[PDB]
Amino acid sequence: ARYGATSTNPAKSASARGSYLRVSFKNTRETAQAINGWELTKAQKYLEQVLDHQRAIPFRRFNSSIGRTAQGKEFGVTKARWPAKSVKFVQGLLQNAAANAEAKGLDATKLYVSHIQVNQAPKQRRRTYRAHGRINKYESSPSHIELVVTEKEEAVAKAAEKKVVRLTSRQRGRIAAQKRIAA
Amino acid sequence: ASLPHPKIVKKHTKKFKRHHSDRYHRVAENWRKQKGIDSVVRRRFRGNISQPKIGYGSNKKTKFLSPSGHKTFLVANVKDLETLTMHTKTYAAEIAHNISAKNRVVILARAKALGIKVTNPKGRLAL
């Protein structure tokens, strides 16, 4: 419980979560943002295509000094990758959320990933040995992954406010004069 | 309902923010005088933040006066309205943040009976 900021209703939503996942937080964030807002089944097909190298995750924030690829063309970027491990973690969580939605009785064909979020888990530390007898850190960057799938619906906003209006005596007189003149 | 006083003039409605309190997070916003030897703020170079001076002082007649013209006064029980009772046109009560809901209701009722204006007659009550 207590996920990130979601704007949906839990009645038509299901969740999945995974903490202390020893997978790269940056590659995982790129994968999550890749599938974010997609249809559940479309995103699953895309993730298996990424595993098959037919498509790529576009690296948009954590992409310094990574290579270029024609597979970025479909996303409008040049820097894309194929993070097998984070893709596998994310699709395991996707299948878990689909299981939860089926349990809750959600249509599962109009399910789309409304919320996906990965932040930094506590690091796992090791030692690395440098020249001249020095020790440096060798730290994993695990991920806290969480996601919410929900059913697609139509436009959710309508029936705006009353919008009370205050005119002056001059404006009321002008409106009356115009009304009397017009036929 | 209240006495017409001289107009309440605020010479500096802007907050005096400490220099570089925007630049650094460790530098709190609370005003601190810059006492550096080279400080442009201390030297009052053109284009720098204004420094608090006594010339910004408020009119004695309108000092401590809220917008309504009443001076604000913390109360914590029904007893303190009993020193605010006969000065409703120059003093406004204010319920302390620490008052429980029932005592807050009783102070509100006492102030309403006495005609005392309170500055927060909305906390802990619904629409």
């Binding site: 209006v165 205050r166 005119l167 002056t168 404006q171 | 053109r46």
Partner: protein
């Protein structure tokens, strides 16, 4: 009629300023057709409107106004100094303002 204007066209030139400091509290207005202080003295003490448009209606109108008046002549060439209730927003340097014919002395 086809022409309905009851005012005089003018342009908001700039704020009152030195070489490198400006005073937003007084703006400079160029009245069309005046090129002399003796000409501008006629418009001295005359109301001025900056009429602009916003996409959100407020009081039944999408048109908002700032009112001011011509205080004194400026310079040698028929520019005047004007003061508005709210200072003009400095994106209107070169925007048209309306110099009405009231209060009237003729």
């Amino acid at each position: 009629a086809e022409s309905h204007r009851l005012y005089v066209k003018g342009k908001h030139l700039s704020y009152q300023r030195s070489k490198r400091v400006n005073n937003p509290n007084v703006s400079l207005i160029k009245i069309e057709g005046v090129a002399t202080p003796q000409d501008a003295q006629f418009y001295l003490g005359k109301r001025i409107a900056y009429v602009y448009r916003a996409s959100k209606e407020v009081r039944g109108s999408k048109i908002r106004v700032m009112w001011g008046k011509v205080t004194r002549t400026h310079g040698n060439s028929g520019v005047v100094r004007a003061t508005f209730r709210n200072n003009l927003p400095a994106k209107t340097f070169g925007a048209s303002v309306r110099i009405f014919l009231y209060p009237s002395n003729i």
